[PDB]
Each structure stands twice: as structure tokens, then as C-alpha cells.
Scaffold this motif. Structure first.
Motif, short mmCIF file in Angstrom:
data_model
loop_
_atom_site.label_atom_id
_atom_site.label_comp_id
_atom_site.label_asym_id
_atom_site.label_seq_id
_atom_site.Cartn_x
_atom_site.Cartn_y
_atom_site.Cartn_z
N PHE A 206 11.51 -16.20 -30.04
CA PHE A 206 12.75 -16.09 -30.73
C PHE A 206 13.69 -15.59 -29.77
O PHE A 206 13.82 -14.30 -29.55
CB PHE A 206 12.83 -15.60 -31.91
CG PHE A 206 12.51 -16.44 -33.09
CD1 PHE A 206 11.32 -16.93 -33.34
CD2 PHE A 206 13.69 -16.99 -34.12
CE1 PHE A 206 11.07 -17.75 -34.51
CE2 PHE A 206 13.31 -17.84 -34.86
CZ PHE A 206 12.04 -18.02 -35.26
N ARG A 207 14.65 -16.33 -29.13
CA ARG A 207 15.73 -15.77 -27.99
C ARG A 207 16.86 -15.23 -28.77
O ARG A 207 17.53 -14.64 -28.35
CB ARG A 207 15.99 -16.93 -27.12
N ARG A 208 17.00 -15.64 -30.16
CA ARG A 208 17.94 -15.06 -30.83
C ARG A 208 18.03 -13.62 -31.15
O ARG A 208 19.01 -12.75 -31.02
CB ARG A 208 18.03 -15.93 -32.39
CG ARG A 208 19.48 -15.57 -33.04
CD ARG A 208 19.47 -16.06 -34.24
NE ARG A 208 19.45 -17.70 -34.31
CZ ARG A 208 18.30 -18.64 -34.60
NH1 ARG A 208 17.10 -17.95 -34.87
NH2 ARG A 208 18.46 -19.85 -34.26
N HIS B 294 17.24 -10.94 -29.17
CA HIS B 294 17.09 -10.43 -28.07
C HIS B 294 18.25 -9.38 -27.66
O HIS B 294 19.52 -9.77 -27.96
CB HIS B 294 17.20 -11.66 -26.95
CG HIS B 294 15.58 -11.77 -26.41
ND1 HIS B 294 15.19 -11.22 -25.27
CD2 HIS B 294 14.72 -12.67 -26.65
CE1 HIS B 294 14.01 -11.59 -25.03
NE2 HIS B 294 13.77 -12.35 -25.69
N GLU C 183 17.64 -7.47 -39.11
CA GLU C 183 17.99 -8.66 -38.34
C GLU C 183 17.07 -9.93 -38.01
O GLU C 183 17.13 -10.93 -38.28
CB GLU C 183 18.35 -8.31 -36.72
N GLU D 14 16.70 -13.88 -39.74
CA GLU D 14 16.42 -14.96 -38.99
C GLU D 14 14.95 -15.43 -38.43
O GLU D 14 14.97 -16.27 -37.54
CB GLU D 14 17.16 -14.62 -37.37
N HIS E 25 20.15 -25.86 -31.50
CA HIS E 25 21.07 -24.94 -31.12
C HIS E 25 21.11 -23.94 -32.05
O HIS E 25 21.01 -24.19 -33.41
CB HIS E 25 22.22 -25.88 -30.96
CG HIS E 25 22.57 -26.43 -29.40
ND1 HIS E 25 22.53 -25.58 -28.32
CD2 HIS E 25 22.89 -27.50 -28.94
CE1 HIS E 25 22.96 -26.17 -27.49
NE2 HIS E 25 22.77 -27.43 -27.76
N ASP E 26 21.37 -22.77 -31.57
CA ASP E 26 21.53 -21.52 -32.62
C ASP E 26 22.79 -21.53 -33.22
O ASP E 26 22.89 -21.34 -34.41
CB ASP E 26 21.30 -20.12 -31.74
CG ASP E 26 19.84 -20.05 -31.39
OD1 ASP E 26 18.99 -20.82 -31.63
OD2 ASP E 26 19.63 -19.11 -30.58
N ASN E 27 23.77 -21.64 -32.47
CA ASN E 27 25.13 -21.83 -33.03
C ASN E 27 25.70 -23.17 -33.23
O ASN E 27 25.00 -24.05 -33.05
CB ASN E 27 26.18 -20.87 -32.17
CG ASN E 27 27.17 -19.86 -33.00
OD1 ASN E 27 27.50 -20.20 -34.03
ND2 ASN E 27 27.03 -18.63 -32.54
N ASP F 285 26.29 -20.88 -28.14
CA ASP F 285 25.11 -19.88 -27.73
C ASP F 285 25.00 -19.93 -26.32
O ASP F 285 23.89 -19.32 -25.71
CB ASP F 285 23.86 -20.42 -28.08
CG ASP F 285 23.31 -21.83 -28.25
OD1 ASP F 285 24.10 -22.40 -27.27
OD2 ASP F 285 22.44 -22.31 -28.51
#
Lengths: 249, 57, 232, 222, 26, 339
Positions: free
Chosen positions: A36-38, A40, A244, A248, F310-312, F332
Motif C-alpha cells: 500500500f503506497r498510500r 507511506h 490511518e 484505508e 488511482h488513489d485520488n 496522487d
């Protein structure tokens, strides 16, 4: 040669099961943080490095247990890994007394402490030469307590001590700020202690104790249960329940 | 003065948009159909191309 | 845009020297720089190259090790410290600039050059033709052959055509054997396979008199060619 | 990978390195949006330091290099996405609106319009965790007008002790902070006048408090 | 002192005593 | 009584136009496209990820060669990517890091950028100095920039937030033609494939056709309930698709002067940020704000696929000149080239 053999076997039992749980509990955290790069940041990168430190220490201690020359590599590797985890705990402490208290330096600390967490203990492990091969190198340098093995316990004892001072300072600063209910302070203390490494702040010094003594019994059964299970007490409060990652996930 | 100028401009624009002949919807749909079925074989999205000819492989 | 190079006179067999190339007119950091020499009554020969950031440096096989090339970005000057000089290295040394991206034009500028006289498995391109008499106002074709196919898997065929008018620095006519560089008239056109190449000049004039050099740029050995003389 | 491709890769890596160098030299900086009308002529910070009108500052040696970003004159719903990552929002309100007149023919109020704008900005979805530093300007002018000009024009409960010249400030603070109903936003406030010097120190203090609060919130300590 | 270091040290010491102190095997 | 006299005439004209449009609709698009095979589940994978950005990506434009695409981000950098190799040919710096538009010239020599500074900057790529420098900063707008498109290497059509669009002459820097008629902030413009007509959509829920040769409106297209945040053009040049903020795209026909099909779904509650067609015109690539890139069939008015990843929110779409790839940029700092 008494039932202390059963004491040792049980002491192995708890720490084997503890590290068996911890390995998976930290592998899942590493995977969820990496894939998960979110989720980070510098904080999460330090978390991932510390999780890797715990995993490597667990693997090394399992390998050493399976083992019991080529054994010399295993012993020093286990010492280096244990030191690197105990030092990444201090690295995490130093981030927080910098993240919020006192101190950007984003390249620094994330890269600066990498050298500190993995490199600084290793340096002492490498310094554990010209002595290991000098005295009592009969076998695999199995550490028969030849009084030549304090170069590995002094840096670690220092790492624990700095963590305790950092913990005390941070909780003293936060409690006043929180109070300008009280359950929030207790929750913060109980969710910060496992990662700050205060769970071994107590039982931190003794020349050495005989196995027959009850002090030895309590010290060993405390610092081989709380440390061996200190993977379920960090991963569960810094990968699954933080605020967080859970949203997610 | 200033306000009524916008009204005059709007009236002129509406007149210009009114003075035009309009074709039926059926003809427009037929033409769009003809163009849309006369280029399907050349669209690397609707009909995927083989991986040999795909430059993003 | 000007690259004047100086710092070479006459060197004894056995001496050493450094060549200076002062550049002014563009951004040096983003531009790689080559070094090309040409012996009198002979052809062009590659010497060395330095890339942006001084990352990759290459030298010719015939002068390997004995040469060193350094980049000085702050002062916008290039250096070439010659070591163990021989009498066979006498030539005219040029400064050739190059930038490499998609659609780039490598070797798009050549300096005036510097003179240096010393007292007494590469892709070798073949140029059988030496001289050709061509009238001013008629078509003429120049061809050179390559031992190895010059078509990489990227789809771009690599071959550079150069022109050296008498007493003037070489200029870039066609890069990658199909694209015409800036400042060249539309008459020039290159075509061919991955081994054999041509150049169909349409309306030759007094400005098209010189030696045409074909170049290979796939391996680092960037072997040039003997050249073709054009006469009226 | 031929020679041209390798050289292109080297150029791309250099471009990436330069992009990283600019990115790490841009995170240090902190953005501060500036809305509001009537008392927005803040040239003091620019003097001390040295469409969109950026006015960078320099506080605490080279540790803090803030950037201010002014407003515009078009629709305020498509230009707002840009300022979602601002570490602070500055809202400027003129206290001389106690006896206020509208620019249009309504002639109703000016602080009430400012209050409505404040409510819209605070409750905006983009600024859901961005602190709203408030700079109540025109201090001496209000100190004179609340005697001379008028007294509590709105008067729902405003200014019981009208002549006290402090209950009015307290009520204005209460009204402007009541539009903030969440505990994740700190509405810092500070009265100031033309003959003042502690106008950017408050901004620095509010920025520090916001940074530490955000660090705590991102962590689990608080 | 670190406990796991202590645990391995005392394991080694017990193993050594099993041949230096337990000589009544015969 | 000038206002009262004119308003009645304006209402009469509007009613007459509406009646003519109603009478000029024999059927709908569905009534003629319901006999064709479904497009099928058009699913595409992330072939490449052009990951080099820092802040949000606000716009993107391809090139004529279907190889180079420019990306504009609020970090202040205009990276000219290379799609087939994920390289970075250029990293154009920006004076003001508030950019919402980017145009890539047909000849590939110029890149345009613009934003809240009301200034469109034409950036020269092919220079003898090897660096990319400004050539002419075009100014005269009183509001923020929304979309710039190159007509040729010398003229740029620009739609801004000052209720106006404009044709610029770069060599002299003067607004050769100014466009008026929008009762709101113009948000996106599209150029017909003949460089003769261009359509724009403002916040007034209206789409307007303009003739750049003269400078007057030709048709006004209405029917949307909210802001138009994107607009595209059919390849054949007789239709254009409107992206809205009420979750409904539309296919406004040009000659018919009406709406042929509305692509609305009950699940979607976000808006459409960018709209781009495919080469054959079968697929209406629409970029929604709910982290999605829904693929709408353009004849059956039905679902065709989803390009999540896509995240955003997605803020720019692009289908190449040959229709080989669809590129998507989101907030993103990521760019993905599907196929």
C-alpha cells in the motif's frame, strides 16, 4: 541438573511461541505497509524498518535455537540482530522527541538514522573481534561468560536508558498539554510504551544471578515473555489500530 | 445604458442562433453509426491489437 | 553558439599536453561532448566522449588509456590531457557537442578545431568510393557500407552523415539516416537498409563541395568512415 | 539499450534527481492562504522579511521560509482545490464594521458578511483539518468608534457593557469562533493595529502549534 | 543486562557443567 | 422599458429555438443503436506508471507522434514524459506553480502552461541553447486559466475564468480575437479536427460553439444542471461530449443542436473531471472524481468497463492520435498509460 532443565525447556517454550506469533504478525504489517503506497511517510518507513528488525531478530534467534566454527557466525549474527532491534527502538524514540517535541530534515533521520539503527550496533559486533579469536575460542565462541562480552551489553543498556528518558520527557510534556478525560493519557501511555521500549526499562541491571534464585526466575520469565511477545504489542498497535491504516486497509 | 447593452448582445446572439437550419436526429445518429463502425478495426482500444504490434507491451 | 578550442602547437615525440575548449552559447551541463580528430590528407577519427554529469566516459581503442577527458561545468571548458604522445597522433582536434533524448540531434555542432603536430571487433564502415566529379546543379549519391546491422530493437536506425567544406568545420547534414538537421536545405535525403546507405543530393551547388563522412552510433566504438571527395 | 537509449536514461535520472532536490527544498516551506477584505493591507511581514500574489517571508533564521498566497476575482469553487494542503489559513476581519455599511444598496452590514464568509471557509470540505489564524485588525479605530460611531448595531446579545471596549472584543471572538464546531481546528486570534510589531510572531507560534498538533494526530499519542 | 544474552550464556554454562561437574556418569 | 421590451423578445426566441429542437428530433440515439452488439467488457491494465511527480496533476496533453505527453502539476514542473520508455525528456520549470492547463503543439516545438496568474506561457522546446525557455507570455485575461489548445505553432485558443475565450497571436502577443457570450466561468475548451471551430463549456451549465475565423458564437447547447468541467470533440467533427459536475456526461450533436444520449448512473455521485473519446468513437473515456476512469460506450449509452487504480481523483485523460493508448493523470502525482 534439577528440574531447572524443565525450567529452561519451558522458557524455550514461551519464547518459541512468542516469536512464532511475532514473525507472522510483523510480516503482515510489512506487507501492508509496502504494497500500500498510500500509507507511506517517514514515520511509516521507520515503522517498516523496525518491523524488519523484529523479524530478523526472530529468525536469527530461531536459527540459533535450532543450532543448539559455523556456529560462530550464528551467534554473532544473533547478537547483531538483537542489537539492531533494540537500537531501532531508540531510533523510533528519537524520531518522536523530534517529530513533535523540539525539532524537517526529511533526508536526515530517515536516512540519517538508517546508519544509526542498523550500522551503529553492527560496528560494536565488528569490534567484538581480536578478542573473540584471542581468548577462549575453543569452539564457535559460544559465550561461556569469559568477562570479554561487555562490548555488546553496554551499547544496548545505553539504548534502553535513552528510551526511558525519552519516554519520561514525552509523557511529562504530553500530560501537561493534555490537561492544559484522563483515560486518554493512559491510552497514550499504553500505546507508546511497547514501541518506545519501556517494557524492559525495568529489570535492566545485575552482575549475574544464579538459576536457583527467584530473582533470576522472575527476570528471565519477564524478559523472555514480554520481549518475545513484543511483536504482537507493536504490530497490533501500529499496523492495525492506529487511525490511518485501518481506514484505508 | 451599460445594463441594456448586455440585453442587446443577448438578443443578437439569440437571433443568430435562431437563424440556422437543423438536421434531424436520425440522420446524425446514422452518420455517427457509420463512422463508428467504419473505424472499429483501426481502434486499438475497442478491438485489442496483438501484443506484437502493441508498443506498450 | 560557439566552441573555440586552443592550446596546442608542436609537441616533441614523447611529450604531453592538455587541450582547452571554451564554450559559450548554451547550457553545458545538459550537453555531452565528444572529441574527433582528422589527420592531414586523411579522414575523421573518434577520440573520446564525456556525458552529462561526468557519468559515462569512453575512449577510442587506438588511444585507450593514454588520453583523459574531463568536464568543468562551472567554467564551461572541456579538457583533454594527452599522455605519451606519439608522431602518429598528429591531426586536427575538434569539439563536438551532443545531447541525447527522444528526437535529439547528436553531433549538431562542431568547433573550429585545434592543430597539433608531433615530429617523428569494431563496426568499421566501408567507403570504397574516394572521389566523384559532379556538376553544380545535378544530382549525386554518396554511399557507405557497414559491417554490422545498424537497426537496434528500438526501431531507430543509427547513421550520421557529415560534411566538411574545404577549410571549414564539419557540419551535420542527416542524423539517424532519415532526419535532416537544422540549417540544412531540404535537398539532402538518406535512405537504405540496415547495412547499405545512400544520400540523394538533389541540386548540388558550390556549397555542397567537400568530403562526406558516414558515422555509426550503436556501439560506443563510434567508427567513422574514410569519406568521399566531391569535385566540380 | 543502445547508446542513445542509455544516454537518455542518464538524462532522465538527472532530471529525477533535480526534481527530488527541489521537492526536499520545498517541503521545508509552509503555505499560508490569505482571504478577507477590508484590512488585508499587510505589508509589515514583507517589510520585515525584506491573480495570485505570493509574498514569501523568512522567520526564525533559515528554519522557516513561509509563503503567502493571496486571492483572486473569479468563482471561488474551482480555484480552491489548489489550496488543500495549506498548513494554515489566514482570515482578516476589520473591527470597524461595528457601525458598517454595505458597498451595494442594501447597506446592511460588513462584519455579518465577513462572518458568513468565515462560516463558508471553516465548513469547506477542503479545509477540514487546516487551522484558521484570525487577525482582527483595526484595533484603535474600533476603540474610537464604539464610543463615537455607534454601539452594538446588531445587538442580539452583543456588547452588554458597550462602553467597556472589551466585552465587544469578547463577543466578536465568541461569534467568530462559534462557526468552528470541531476540535480538529484551532481558531487562533490576535488584535493588531498599524502601530504594532508582534504581527508575524503570532503567525509563527500558530504555525508551530499546528505542525505539532498535526504530527500528534498523524501519530497515536493524541 | 540483556536477558536473551543471559539465557544463551547460562545455557552454555549448564552444558559445560554437564561435563565438568557431572563426572559421576561412570 | 428597454429591459422589459427586450426580455420578451429573448424569451420568444428561446421558446422558438426549443420548439424547433423538439420538432427536429425524430427519435433518439438508443432507438437506432439498440440493434448493435454490445461493446463488451473493455478492461485495460496499467502498462506503465509515469511516476515522477510530487504534487497533484492537473492536466495532461499528448503529442501528434503518440509518444510524448506533457504533465502539469502544482509543484511547478512540466515534465515531457516519453510514454514508451517512462523517461523524462524535459522538466520545464514554471514561474508560478499554479497550473491547470497544458497544451502540446502539433509540431512538438511548444508547450503551453497557465493557471491562476491569468497568464499563458508558451515554452519553446527546440532551441539552439539546449534549454527550454519562455517565448511569449500571453496576458490580458482578468481571471484564471482553464484550457489552452494550440491551433498551429503561432495561434493558441485560450478559455479563461473571465467569462471569455480568446484567440492569441504568439508572434505579436495580441488577442487577435476575443470571445464573449458566457454567463459564467469558462472551464474547458475543445478544438475540432479542422482548426476552424471550437466548443467551450462554462459554469453556467451551457456549451457554446465558436468560429475562430470570425469570433461569434454559432450555437448554444444547454441541458446540463451543474457546471461543465470538461469537454471533448468527436473525431468526425459533428458531435461533442460534455463532462459535467452532476455525474452525467452528454453527447451534444452539432448539426442536430440537441442531446443524443446521457450517460448517467444511480451509483455515481461525484463529477466528471475530464472527457476524451477514442479513435473509432465507440468509447467515451470519462474521468470521475471517485478514483475511477469509467469507460462509457458512446452509441448504446451503456457501461463498458472500469479503469480503477488511482488513489485520488482523475483530473486528466488522453487518447493518442492513433488511438493506441489512454493515459490518465490523478491528484496522487501518478500517470498511468492503459491499453
Amino acid at each position: 541438573e534439577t528440574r531447572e532443565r524443565e525450567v529452561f525447556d519451558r522458557l524455550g517454550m514461551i519464547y518459541t511461541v512468542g516469536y512464532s506469533v511475532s514473525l507472522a504478525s510483523l510480516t503482515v504489517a510489512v506487507l501492508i505497509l509496502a504494497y500500500f503506497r498510500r500509507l507511506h511517510c517517514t514515520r511509516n518507513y521507520i515503522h517498516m524498518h523496525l518491523f524488519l528488525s523484529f523479524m530478523l531478530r526472530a529468525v536469527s534467534i530461531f536459527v540459533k535455537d535450532a543450532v543448539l566454527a559455523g556456529c560462530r557466525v550464528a551467534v554473532t549474527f544473533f547478537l547483531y540482530f538483537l542489537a539492531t532491534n533494540y537500537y531501532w527502538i531508540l531510533v523510533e524514540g528519537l524520531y518522536l522527541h523530534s517529530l513533535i517535541f523540539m525539532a524537517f530534515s526529511e533526508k536526515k533521520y530517515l536516512w540519517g538514522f538508517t546508519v544509526f539503527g542498523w550500522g551503529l550496533p553492527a560496528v560494536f559486533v565488528a569490534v567484538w573481534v581480536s578478542v573473540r579469536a584471542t581468548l577462549a575460542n575453543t569452539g564457535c565462541w559460544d559465550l561461556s561468560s569469559g568477562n570479554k562480552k561487555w562490548i555488546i551489553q553496554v551499547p544496548i543498556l545505553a539504548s534502553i536508558v535513552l528510551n526511558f528518558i525519552l519516554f519520561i520527557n514525552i509523557v511529562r510534556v504530553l500530560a501537561t498539554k493534555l490537561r492544559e478525560q484522563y483515560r486518554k493519557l493512559l491510552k497514550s501511555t499504553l500505546v507508546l510504551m511497547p514501541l518506545f521500549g519501556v517494557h524492559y526499562i525495568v529489570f535492566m541491571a545485575t552482575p549475574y544471578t544464579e538459576v536457583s534464585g527467584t530473582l533470576w526466575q522472575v527476570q528471565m520469565h519477564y524478559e523472555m515473555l514480554f520481549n518475545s511477545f513484543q511483536g504482537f504489542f507493536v504490530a497490533i498497535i501500529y499496523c492495525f489500530c492506529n487511525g490511518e491504516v485501518q481506514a484505508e486497509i | 445604458t451599460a445594463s441594456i447593452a448586455q440585453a442587446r448582445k443577448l438578443v443578437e446572439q439569440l437571433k443568430m442562433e435562431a437563424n440556422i437550419d437543423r438536421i434531424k436526429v436520425s440522420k446524425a445518429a446514422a452518420d455517427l453509426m457509420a463512422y463508428c463502425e467504419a473505424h472499429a478495426k483501426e481502434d486499438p482500444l475497442l478491438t485489442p491489437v496483438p501484443a506484437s504490434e502493441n508498443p506498450f507491451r | 553558439v560557439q566552441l573555440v578550442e586552443s592550446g596546442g602547437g608542436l609537441v616533441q615525440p614523447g611529450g604531453s599536453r592538455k587541450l582547452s575548449c571554451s564554450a559559450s552559447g548554451f547550457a553545458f551541463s545538459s550537453f555531452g561532448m565528444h572529441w574527433v580528430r582528422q589527420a592531414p590528407e586523411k579522414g575523421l577519427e573518434w577520440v573520446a566522449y564525456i556525458s552529462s554529469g561526468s557519468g559515462t566516459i569512453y575512449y577510442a581503442d587506438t588511444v585507450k588509456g593514454r588520453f583523459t577527458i574531463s568536464r568543468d561545468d562551472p567554467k564551461n571548458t572541456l579538457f583533454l590531457q594527452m599522455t605519451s604522445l606519439r608522431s602518429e597522433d598528429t591531426a586536427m582536434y575538434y569539439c563536438v557537442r551532443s545531447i541525447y533524448y527522444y528526437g535529439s540531434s547528436p553531433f549538431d555542432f562542431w568547433g573550429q578545431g585545434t592543430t597539433l603536430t608531433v615530429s617523428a571487433a569494431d563496426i568499421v564502415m566501408t567507403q570504397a568510393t574516394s572521389s566523384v566529379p559532379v556538376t553544380p546543379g545535378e544530382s549525386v549519391s554518396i554511399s557507405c557500407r557497414s559491417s554490422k546491422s545498424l537497426l537496434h530493437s528500438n526501431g531507430n536506425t543509427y547513421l550520421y552523415w557529415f560534411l566538411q567544406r574545404p577549410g571549414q568545420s564539419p557540419q551535420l547534414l542527416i542524423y539517424r539516416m532519415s532526419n535532416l538537421a537544422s540549417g540544412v536545405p531540404d535537398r539532402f535525403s538518406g535512405s537504405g537498409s540496415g547495412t547499405a546507405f545512400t544520400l540523394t543530393i538533389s541540386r548540388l551547388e558550390a556549397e555542397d563541395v567537400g568530403v562526406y563522412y558516414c558515422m555509426q552510433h550503436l556501439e560506443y566504438p563510434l567508427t567513422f568512415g574514410a569519406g568521399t571527395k566531391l569535385e566540380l | 539499450l543502445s547508446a542513445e537509449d542509455k544516454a537518455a536514461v542518464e538524462r532522465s535520472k538527472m532530471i529525477d534527481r533535480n526534481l527530488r532536490e527541489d521537492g526536499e527544498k520545498a517541503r521545508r516551506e509552509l503555505k499560508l492562504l490569505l482571504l478577507g477584505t477590508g484590512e488585508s493591507g499587510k505589508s509589515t511581514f514583507i517589510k520585515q522579511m525584506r491573480g495570485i500574489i505570493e509574498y514569501p517571508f523568512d522567520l526564525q533564521s533559515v528554519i522557516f521560509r513561509m509563503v503567502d498566497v493571496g486571492g483572486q476575482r473569479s468563482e471561488r469553487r474551482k480555484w480552491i482545490h489548489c489550496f488543500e494542503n495549506v498548513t494554515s489559513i489566514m482570515f482578516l476581519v476589520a473591527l470597524s464594521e461595528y457601525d458598517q455599511v454595505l458597498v451595494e444598496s442594501d447597506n446592511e452590514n460588513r462584519m455579518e458578511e465577513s462572518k458568513a464568509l468565515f462560516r463558508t471557509i471553516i465548513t469547506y470540505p477542503w479545509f477540514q483539518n487546516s487551522s484558521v489564524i484570525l487577525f482582527l485588525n483595526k484595533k484603535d479605530l474600533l476603540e474610537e468608534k464604539i464610543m463615537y460611531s455607534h454601539l452594538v448595531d446588531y445587538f442580539p446579545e452583543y456588547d452588554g457593557p458597550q462602553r467597556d471596549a472589551q466585552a465587544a472584543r469578547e463577543f466578536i471572538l465568541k461569534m467568530f469562533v462559534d462557526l468552528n464546531p470541531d476540535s480538529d481546528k484551532i481558531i487562533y486570534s490576535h488584535f493588531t493595529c498599524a502601530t504594532d510589531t508582534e504581527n508575524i510572531r503570532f503567525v509563527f507560534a500558530a504555525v508551530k502549534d499546528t505542525i505539532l498538533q498535526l504530527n500528534l494526530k498523524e501519530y497515536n499519542l493524541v | 543486562a540483556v536477558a536473551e544474552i543471559q539465557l544463551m550464556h547460562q545455557r552454555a554454562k549448564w552444558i559445560q557443567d554437564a561435563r565438568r561437574r557431572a563426572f559421576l556418569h561412570k | 422599458s428597454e429591459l422589459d421590451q427586450l426580455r420578451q423578445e429573448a424569451e420568444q426566441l428561446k421558446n422558438q429555438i426549443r420548439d424547433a429542437r423538439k420538432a427536429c428530433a425524430d427519435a433518439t440515439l438508443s432507438q437506432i443503436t439498440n440493434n448493435i452488439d454490445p461493446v463488451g467488457r473493455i478492461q485495460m491494465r496499467t502498462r506503465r506508471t509515469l511516476r515522477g511527480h510530487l504534487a497533484k496533476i492537473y492536466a495532461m496533453h499528448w503529442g501528434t507522434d503518440s509518444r510524448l505527453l506533457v504533465s502539469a502539476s502544482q509543484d511547478g514542473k512540466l515534465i515531457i514524459w516519453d510514454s514508451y520508455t517512462t523517461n523524462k525528456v524535459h522538466a520545464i520549470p514554471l514561474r508560478s506553480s499554479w497550473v491547470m492547463t497544458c497544451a502540446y503543439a502539433p509540431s512538438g516545438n511548444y508547450v503551453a502552461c497557465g493557471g491562476l496568474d491569468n497568464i499563458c506561457s508558451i515554452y519553446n522546446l527546440k532551441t539552439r541553447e539546449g534549454n527550454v525557455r519562455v517565448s511569449r507570455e500571453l496576458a490580458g485575461h482578468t481571471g484564471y486559466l482553464s484550457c489552452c489548445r494550440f491551433l498551429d505553432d503561432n495561434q493558441i485558443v485560450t478559455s479563461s475564468g473571465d467569462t471569455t475565450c480568446a484567440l492569441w497571436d504568439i508572434e505579436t502577443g495580441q488577442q487577435t480575437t476575443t470571445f464573449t457570450g458566457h454567463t459564467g466561468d469558462v472551464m474547458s475548451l475543445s478544438l475540432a479536427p479542422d482548426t476552424r471551430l471550437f466548443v467551450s463549456g462554462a459554469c453556467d451549465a451551457s456549451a457554446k460553439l465558436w468560429d475562430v475565423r470570425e469570433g461569434m458564437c454559432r450555437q448554444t447547447f444547454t441541458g446540463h444542471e451543474s457546471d461543465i468541467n470538461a469537454i471533448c470533440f468527436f473525431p468526425n467533427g459533428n458531435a461533442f461530449a460534455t463532462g459535467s459536475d452532476d455525474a452525467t456526461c452528454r453527447l451534444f450533436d452539432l448539426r442536430a443542436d440537441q442531446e443524443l444520449m446521457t450517460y448517467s448512473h444511480d451509483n455515481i455521485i461525484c463529477g466528471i473531471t475530464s472527457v476524451s473519446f477514442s479513435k473509432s468513437g465507440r468509447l467515451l473515456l470519462a474521468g470521475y472524481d471517485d478514483f475511477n476512469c469509467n469507460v462509457w460506450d458512446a452509441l448504446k449509452a451503456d457501461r463498458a468497463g472500469v479503469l480503477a487504480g488511482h488513489d485520488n481523483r482523475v483530473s486528466c485523460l488522453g487518447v493518442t492520435d492513433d488511438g493506441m493508448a489512454v493515459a490518465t493523470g490523478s491528484w496522487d502525482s501518478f500517470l498511468k498509460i492503459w491499453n
